[PDB]
Design a protein around this ligand. Structure first.
Ligand code: D21
Ligand code: D21
Ligand code: ACD
Ligand code: ACD
Ligand code: EIC
Ligand code: EIC
Ligand code: K
Ligand code: K
Ligand code: K
Ligand code: K
Lengths: 287, 287
């Protein structure tokens, strides 16, 4: 039964239901995957706290106050090991780069009322500009791929909007580009930041996808070797990876929309008895 | 001078330069705004650490080790005050919701190799699906606004793709909707989480814009009053706010593209001597 509703509303409802099921399944998987590690780490921390309390003769009240003070310090940008100044010009540049790309690592956060108000306004404008930049970069990359494909075809036969690349081809190119960027960034990060290669790849995916957990943040140590060049390389790699991964997300979203249309059509056609865009859309008028 | 380059490449270059200038200016403003508060907080932490070291007769080595252990505990999900289980089913649902929407608060992060691999794959697929969902929601809201405007016009004259709303109107509706959602969410959060109203508004903007700093995370205390209803309300409000703010970002990006075209045209026309989309684009072919 079609349900006397249009195709688009059915697509919206199906996508919402699928996302809810995906969230439930992912939550179950993650819990079953690392609840034990959580509990072990908590028990280890409790053992360490008890040992420290016994070994230096302090109750839990003074230790609680000290830990609260240290939490305030960390929120202010203090770490046990050496860390770069949090709100110098370079640190502020890192912070605004994280805000502008909606990454938000969290190592640098505003702590003043004026700071937070300016964060709101600046983030609004900059995030809009950055989404526009990502869309423009995706369009430019698609045009480049089309031009290169045309040139290669003309060279092959000798030996633009006409023959444009398909969605699958662009998705494959974006996938391999993201893999290469992540591999190079991890190759740089592993011997510099001291992380493992897998940890570097995980951080690369976290930063590129604009998730920005904040557990791993690059270029945060107080001093580096060739510090300016390292910072420039880190910025370039993060920007390139974020652009590539965002374009990949958009292309996979197009593919998922195609798949959603297909499954909706199949269910409407022969699965009922078997129980047992905005640019040409909203920008077009304002022109 | 046009520079014998097409309009789109010039638009890309101008946007990149403007974003670089915006980043530099924002970094300067943020640094000048809160470097003093940073330094004051750091000095306060140093004073507190020295006082604690003097008052209980411990050197800096044992305190350094204790603070490193506490940092590991916090990375494991331990706080000085009571906090909910980090990787139970509800906590895992919160985590996957943060990952799927690219918010990434950071209070819950994977700590196992399999956890990180599944995070990579699940985040890829879910973020693609969620970007598609946000685009579909924006299209549906635009259609709803068009239908409502048609009905209101027909009622007014009595007393669809034809008369569609413009970009300015949709932007204004999205702005007021985001303001209302943020106000309601702050009204709920202020007496529950204990934050100030301005802090609640700041957290609302941070979460809605998918920045997710992680300094403020809602529904993290161990126990609440009507805990299930509160969690449901928090989820609904965060989802609605994220959708609205993302749509607002896209609309403002369209407006910024219009402005960029205008400034490029003006500079090409009469400012030289004065010195002193993807859907109809890439999805169209694959259909
Ligand atoms: C949460 C996830 C929401 C979306 C994922 C669930 C459904 C996706 C798999 C659909 C099952 C088969 C449908 C299918 O063949 O998709 C076809 C192509 O789509 C795909 O290959 C799978 C979708 C991409 C998945 C990520 C890569 C549609 O093309 P066509 O009609 O021309 O054959
Ligand atoms: C980093 C920021 C990058 C973009 C911001 C810098 C330039 C934006 C302001 C442009 C200065 C005036 C241009 C202008 O009038 O924009 C006009 C409308 O755009 C605007 O109102 C300003 C842009 C929106 C800004 C955020 C809201 C273009 O429309 P029209 O041609 O029909 O008159
Ligand atoms: C940034 C996106 C691109 C990511 C490209 C790489 C992602 C794939 C994951 C790499 C494999 C990691 C090997 C680490 C060793 C763990 C043992 C095998 C665990 C398993 O396999 O069960
Ligand atoms: C989520 C996006 C919508 C946000 C809507 C509200 C944002 C505007 C900011 C609200 C004003 C905050 C008042 C706090 C009191 C500070 C004194 C004035 C500081 C100043 O003004 O210099
Ligand atoms: C081509 C110019 C850039 C235009 C688009 C910019 C938007 C994307 C920038 C996001 C960068 C995120 C992290 C940057 C950290 C570098 C700071 C440093 O360690 O020094
Ligand atoms: C209409 C169904 C949803 C479909 C789209 C879902 C994508 C957006 C969801 C992001 C939610 C972010 C935070 C959720 C935290 C709630 C967890 C809890 O405190 O319990
Ligand atoms: K984020
Ligand atoms: K974060
Ligand atoms: K984040
Ligand atoms: K984000």
């Amino acid at each position: 039964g079609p349900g006397h509703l249009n195709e688009d509303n059915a697509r919206f409802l199906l996508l919402a239901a699928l996302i809810v099921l995906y969230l439930l399944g992912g939550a179950a998987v993650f819990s079953a995957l690392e609840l034990a590690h959580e509990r072990q780490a908590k028990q280890r921390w409790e053992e360490r706290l008890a040992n420290f309390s016994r070994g230096h003769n302090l109750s839990r009240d003074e230790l609680r106050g000290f830990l609260r003070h240290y939490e305030e310090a960390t929120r202010a940008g203090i770490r046990v090991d050496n860390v770069r100044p949090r709100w110098d010009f370079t640190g502020a540049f890192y912070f605004v780069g994280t805000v502008v790309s909606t990454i938000g690592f969290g190592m640098t956060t505003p702590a003043t009322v004026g700071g937070k108000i300016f964060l709101i306004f600046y983030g609004l404008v900059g995030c809009s500009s950055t989404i526009l930049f990502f869309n423009l970069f995706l369009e430019r990359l698609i045009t480049i791929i089309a031009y290169i494909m045309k040139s290669c075809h003309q060279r092959q036969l000798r030996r633009l909007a006409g023959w444009k690349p398909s969605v699958y081809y662009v998705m494959l190119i974006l996938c391999t580009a993201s893999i290469l960027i992540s591999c190079c960034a991890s190759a740089m990060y592993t011997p510099i930041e001291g992380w493992s290669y897998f940890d570097s790849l995980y951080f690369c995916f976290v930063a590129f996808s604009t998730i920005g957990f904040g557990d791993l943040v690059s270029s945060q140590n107080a001093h580096y070797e060739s510090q300016g060049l390292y910072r420039f390389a880190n910025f370039v790699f993060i920007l390139m990876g974020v652009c590539c991964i965002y374009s990949l997300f958009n292309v996979i979203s197009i593919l998922i929309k195609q798949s959603l249309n297909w499954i909706l059509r199949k269910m409407d056609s022969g699965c009922c008895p078997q129980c047992q865009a905005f640019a040409i859309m909203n920008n077009r008028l304002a022109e």
